[PDB]
Amino acid sequence: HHAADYVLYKDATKPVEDRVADLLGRMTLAEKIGQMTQIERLVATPDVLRDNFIGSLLSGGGSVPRKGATAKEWQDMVDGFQKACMSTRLGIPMIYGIDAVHGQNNVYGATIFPHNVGLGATRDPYLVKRIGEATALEVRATGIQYAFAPCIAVCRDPRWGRCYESYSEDRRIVQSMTELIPGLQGDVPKDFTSGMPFVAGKNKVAACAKHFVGDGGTVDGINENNTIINREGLMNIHMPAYKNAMDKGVSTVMISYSSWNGVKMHANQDLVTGYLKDTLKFKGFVISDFEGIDRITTPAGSDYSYSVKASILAGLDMIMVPNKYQQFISILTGHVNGGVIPMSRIDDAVTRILRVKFTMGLFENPYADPAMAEQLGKQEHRDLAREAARKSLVLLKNGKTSTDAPLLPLPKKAPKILVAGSHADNLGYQCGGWTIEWQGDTGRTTVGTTILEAVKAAVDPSTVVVFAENPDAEFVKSGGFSYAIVAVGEHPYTETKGDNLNLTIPEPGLSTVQAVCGGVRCATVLISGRPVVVQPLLAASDALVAAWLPGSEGQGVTDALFGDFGFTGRLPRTWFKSVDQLPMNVGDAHYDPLFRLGYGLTTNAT
Ligand SMILES: CO[C@@H]1O[C@H](CO)[C@@H](O)[C@H](O)[C@H]1S[C@@H]1O[C@H](CO)[C@@H](O)[C@H](O)[C@H]1O
Ligand SMILES: *[C@@H]1O[C@H](CO)[C@@H](O)[C@H](O)[C@H]1NC(C)=O
Ligand SMILES: *[C@@H]1O[C@H](CO)[C@@H](O)[C@H](O)[C@H]1NC(C)=O
Ligand SMILES: *[C@@H]1O[C@H](CO)[C@@H](O)[C@H](O)[C@H]1NC(C)=O
């Protein structure tokens, strides 16, 4: 269809399947295996991308061009990499992926949304789709096309360091939150075939249902460990949200580090090929986790040859190498050349990677759009996040006896009030993990509003606000305070650093709460990624709020504390009495919760 140098794969009016086949039929083995290779930006250069025909780049946690980098600096990095890839013989654009898992969270000045567990508390799948929408805009502002989200793990033991990344222990709630997908990607059209990949265009991003499958079901919530459960439990708890993901056209699926009844997920041909591909009819691409194939073996990386064979034969399409790309490429090339991996397996992986790239419009818009840069940290999106933070809060207690005046909502006018605790004026702590750094961080790491700042912004001008991080009891008693807001809880963590067998918040926490509440009527805001031991915190407090990891917009906290909106959130998990009860989930036989799933007190706007 027209000029004499016409190449069908480059014709944007042809059907995606036609473009895929046309390109595929021209590629060498080296160009094919290059598509299946994703590398970290830290090892990428123009010659490496060009000479190995690389298919994808990512930024892992905290992998950034520099600290404080603008949206424009991100776009230029990405475009730099893309220009190298476009200069190959076939000019196959790369796709760049990142963990935008509560906003575009590696990026300075990006809106940071509440983490998933909070989002579960809102029971509001439309809110979540809207967060999808806004997140895609902030991701594209940085020139990125691909977000490794949502995590649709069903966390079954809060001792897991990734429990905050799961919407709920109830798979019904996780299923309903897969609306993040069409938020990120766009609504699939009228007559869409379930399992097809979809992205609407250059203002949307490819998504990633992760981590397939049973990541949330591991023994004692040990991260990357074994999930021991029969097929029926696997299918009825851990799988259903992947099917909803198929119906919404999720573009990619990332495989889990975890194992199911002893089999590494990265080596499981039955689940990856037999079930995801052949039974759910997934036509997008399947990507490893970060050195996921290495960890097939014990020790990890001790037989990389096997790692490659097993993972690729299992059915994985793209490998998040992400550093030793030369070895990965050499090994896979060697296995194809020796007939150990058939060309049909290679052609299938490449067919899928290209399908996603063509379908999302990457060949037509390989480069970043500088007018999208101003979407980073947009106030409209912060106002959404603030809404989400407010809706996520669960009021556990609001008065020490059923006869006391309720403490919340608090009046904005009072001569003098106290704000206290390690989490009252600490942005990093209120964002938690996967914020600027991989593990999150402490203090003022990005743009936002801490609890203290939000209080100051909310109160009557005549109200005197005093901050003290960890005051003693005499300070409180002597201070002439009308009430106190005290914020404490967990430090930021991510993956295995967060695995925790005791779930007790660090000190000082409880002792500040005791000191403060012993001198004045107090509202304790508890910041955590999960239920933690809370009886002592309850005994001391007039009111206690479980605010999860609410993100950059701390005004969502005060919106509820001061009565602009009523508390409506409900526990998306069971709150245990004791860690020895664990695992303990709603529907279990000796369900003995401190607070059951669904619990939450309410208030009315004032
Ligand atoms: C930087 O991402 C993380 O980096 C640390 C730094 O050492 C690695 O050891 C971690 O295992 C990865 S975790 C893994 O990364 C994916 C991409 O970052 C992510 O989508 C996935 O959910 C994680 O399990
Ligand atoms: C589970 O964790 C232990 C360390 O506690 C490790 O030795 C074992 O290999 C892990 N199993 C799996 C399947 O990851
Ligand atoms: C609880 O467990 C974590 C390990 O994840 C540890 O850092 C902390 O010191 C422990 N606290 C108590 C009270 O045992
Ligand atoms: C808010 O409205 C509910 C429903 O009628 C009511 O039960 C609750 O006690 C009210 N609280 C107020 C006005 O403080």
Residue numbers in the entry: -3 to 602
Show the paper's wording.
In the barley β-d-glucan glucohydrolase, a glycoside hydrolase family 3 (GH3) enzyme, the Trp286/Trp434 clamp ensures β-d-glucosides binding, which is fundamental for substrate hydrolysis during plant growth and development. HvExoI folds into a two-domain structure consisting of an (α/β)8 barrel (domain 1) and an (α/β)6 sandwich (domain 2) with a 13 Å-deep active site pocket embracing the subsites −1 and +1, positioned at the interface between the two domains. HvExoI catalyses the hydrolytic removal of nonreducing glucose (Glc) moiety from a broad spectrum of poly- and oligomeric β-d-glucosides. The crucial role of substrate binding in HvExoI implies a pair of the aromatic Trp286 and Trp434 residues that form a clamp at the +1 subsite, which is positioned next to a pocket-shaped site at the −1 subsite, housing the Asp285 and Glu491 catalysts.
The G2SG-OMe thio-analogue bound weakly to native and WT recombinant HvExoI with the respective Ki of 2 ×10−3 M and 4 ×10−3 M, reflecting its ability to attach at the +1 and +2 subsites instead of the −1 and +1 subsites, which was most likely due to the rigidity of this thio-ligand. On the other hand, in W286F the electron density map of G2SG-OMe was defined at the −1 and +1 subsites, where this thio-ligand formed H-bonds with Asp95, Lys206, His207, Arg158, Tyr253, Asp285, Arg291, and Glu491, and stacking interactions with W286F and Trp434, whereas G2SG-OMe did not bind to W286A and W286Y.
